[PDB]
Amino acid sequence: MIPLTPLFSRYKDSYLLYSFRLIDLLRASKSTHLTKLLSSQATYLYHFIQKYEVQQLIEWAINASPDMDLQQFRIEFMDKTTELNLRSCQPKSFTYTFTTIWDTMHFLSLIIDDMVYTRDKLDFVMQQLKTMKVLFYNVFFILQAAMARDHYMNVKGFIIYHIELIEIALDKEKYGTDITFVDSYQQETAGADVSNNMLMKNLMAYVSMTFHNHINDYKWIQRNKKPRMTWGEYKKLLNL
Amino acid sequence: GSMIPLTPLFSRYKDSYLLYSFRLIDLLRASKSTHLTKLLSSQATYLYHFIQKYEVQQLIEWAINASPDMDLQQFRIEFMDKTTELNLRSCQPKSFTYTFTTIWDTMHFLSLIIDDMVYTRDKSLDFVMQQLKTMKVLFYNVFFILQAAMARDHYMNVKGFIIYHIELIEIALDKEKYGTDITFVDSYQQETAGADVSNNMLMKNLMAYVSMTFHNHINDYKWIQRNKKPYERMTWGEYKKLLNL
Ligand SMILES: Cc1cc2nc3c(=O)[nH]c(=O)nc-3n(C[C@H](O)[C@H](O)[C@H](O)COP(=O)(O)OP(=O)(O)OC[C@H]3O[C@@H](n4cnc5c(N)ncnc54)[C@H](O)[C@@H]3O)c2cc1C
Ligand SMILES: Cc1cc2nc3c(=O)[nH]c(=O)nc-3n(C[C@H](O)[C@H](O)[C@H](O)COP(=O)(O)OP(=O)(O)OC[C@H]3O[C@@H](n4cnc5c(N)ncnc54)[C@H](O)[C@@H]3O)c2cc1C
């Protein structure tokens, strides 16, 4: 039940592009550990009948020839998803950038807010958040970005931590105290300081927005240089 | 000059910090790889960093060569003599009882040191900024030492939370190098509103509060992990009072 907007459609398509670029690495995996974590991630991304057909796609990517180039792999993937009734998995644009990854993280963020606001009063949603944590813990850049990978590796806990707050909030609700949805991040962070069960509406949209801003502020430190998205602007763009 | 207030609690913190540090260099004789040797001895060097430097190198080098066949108690005795011979009796801990609270006290200790370096900076701003990078490496590489697989996995999912607030201070001191002085605010909410704008607001005692909030979060999450229903939590009011902040 996420609002349909121009930006959300781009998020949707970057999400597919990101997922396609991930199962393409599977044929190149240099270890069983990497094979396991790539295919697991891919299975989770598409998760957010269609399950069984998604297993066939992953299994196709695992055996796909290492000797194809990306273009060749794209062609065989378009056919496979056509034969598996998964044209919906097909990305419209294949131009892969940092914004593809951002759009994916923002997409997941909106999925989370949407599951918690349309929850049925629960173990299900709480299992979905664990999966979400593994997806955020394990974001692949795919593109060459040594400095970006290490930075994210350092501060990704910021996002995941807020996913754990939602878990605590739903644990409180399965045990009597319902969630009170508040409008700001500040009402939530004050309420932690005491019972109460306040959860910011659209929490992960905001969290990944502040996070996105933080990475862009911090990169004027990483290259010595003297130098944004506001929450109001972001809600307007996404119809939150 | 550590302008940190002297408190009963802050004295425990300072002793657990030494206990933590002592238990860390004890592993060096048991390191099964060059990588862990390198990361353990770097972490120990940095921990003691918060001339004392040359004697701390001698201590670390002594621990790298220490016999793997000693027991902890053996290593403790040889450690006490070594620090005595190196004029580093201030490195010697008073209580050797090592628990989870030892680790908490160490992370809280480091948090106050960060707040203090920033409170008492000299517009040394390069200096403090390089200290915060080192701090990020200490929080990224927290060792449990004791057996605790589940705490270790949880910490490595959410440690970015702490580290992210260290980058805020970094960004704060960076725009202060470039003109906009830091404005200090008393609550975490004022700072969070300020980020959502030219402004350069930073909470007084930010990392004390961030580590206290984080401490509470782990204890909240542990009741999901073991599946129960929970209790008096630590509040920022009484934490400031306990530490005379
Ligand atoms: C997890 C991750 C970690 C990264 N770490 C680093 C790093 O350490 N060092 C480095 O130099 N680069 C890093 N990058 C890349 C960096 O953030 C930018 O993508 C890069 O600098 C390209 O510049 P840009 O302005 O076009 O990107 P961006 O401005 O971030 O992307 C442009 C798009 O994002 C939209 N957008 C901008 N800000 C926001 C916001 N707060 N919230 C939501 N949407 C927004 C804009 O509308 C535009 O559509 C990282 C990227 C990701 C996904
Ligand atoms: C980085 C780290 C990660 C951990 N992850 C886990 C985990 O995933 N699962 C698990 O079961 N255990 C975990 N633990 C251990 C856990 O946090 C407790 O120490 C453990 O449950 C023992 O309970 P306790 O009440 O005796 O410790 P605590 O409740 O933390 O008390 C020890 C001392 O800390 C003081 N204190 C208490 N609360 C605060 C606060 N919010 N802020 C500042 N000081 C406070 C108290 O005065 C007390 O003296 C972790 C510990 C650390 C240091």
- Cβ count within 10 A of residue B82: 18
Residue A228 in contact with residue A210, Cβ under 8 Å? no
* Residue of chain B whose Cα is closest to the Cα of A170: B224
- Minimal CA separation from B237 to chain A, in Å: 9
d(CA B172, CA B180): 9
Tokens of A232: 């109001």
Under DSSP, the state recorded for A73 is: H
Rounded to whole angstroms, the maximal C-alpha distance in chain B is 59
* Residue of chain B whose Cα is closest to the Cα of A206: B196
Contacts of B62 (CB under 8 A, 6+ apart): B82
Tokens of B31: 């390191």
User: This structure's resolution (angstroms)?
Assistant: 2.5
Q: Which of A98, A108, A225 to mutate to test the pocket of ligand 1 (most atoms within 8 A of CB)?
A: A98
Element (H, E) at A118: none
B183 φ, ψ (degrees, to nearest 5): -100, 130
d(CA A116, CA A119): 5
d(CA A109, CA A35): 26
Instruction: Tell me how many domains chain A contains.
Output: 1
From chain B, the residues in CB contact with A156 under 8 A are 160
Element (H, E) at A91: none
d(CA B28, CA B67): 10
B12-16: list long-range contacts, CB under 8 Å, 24+ apart: B12/B105, B13/B105, B13/B106, B13/B108, B13/B109, B13/B112, B14/B109, B15/B93, B15/B94, B15/B95, B15/B105, B16/B93, B16/B95, B16/B101, B16/B102, B16/B103, B16/B104, B16/B105, B16/B106, B16/B109
Breaks in chain B after (C-N > 2.5 angstroms):
50, 123, 197, 230
For residues B84, B86, B92, B98, the Cα torsion angle rounded to the nearest 10 degrees is -110
B212-218: list long-range contacts, CB under 8 Å, 24+ apart: B212/B108, B212/B236, B212/B239, B213/A192, B213/A193, B213/B188, B214/A161, B214/B158, B214/B161, B214/B162, B215/B104, B215/B108, B216/A192, B217/A161, B217/A164, B217/A165, B217/A168, B217/B158, B217/B161, B218/B151, B218/B154, B218/B155
- Minimal CA separation from A131 to chain B, in Å: 13
Q: Which atom of ligand 2 is nearest to the CA of B153?
A: 8
- Minimal CA separation from A53 to chain B, in Å: 31
Of B10, B25, B13, the closest CA to residue B88 belongs to B25
Q: Do B160 and A160 lie within an 8 Å CB cutoff?
A: yes
Single-letter amino acid, residue A42: A
Show the domain range for A80.
1-240
From chain B, the residues in CB contact with A161 under 8 A are 157-158, 160-161, 214, 217
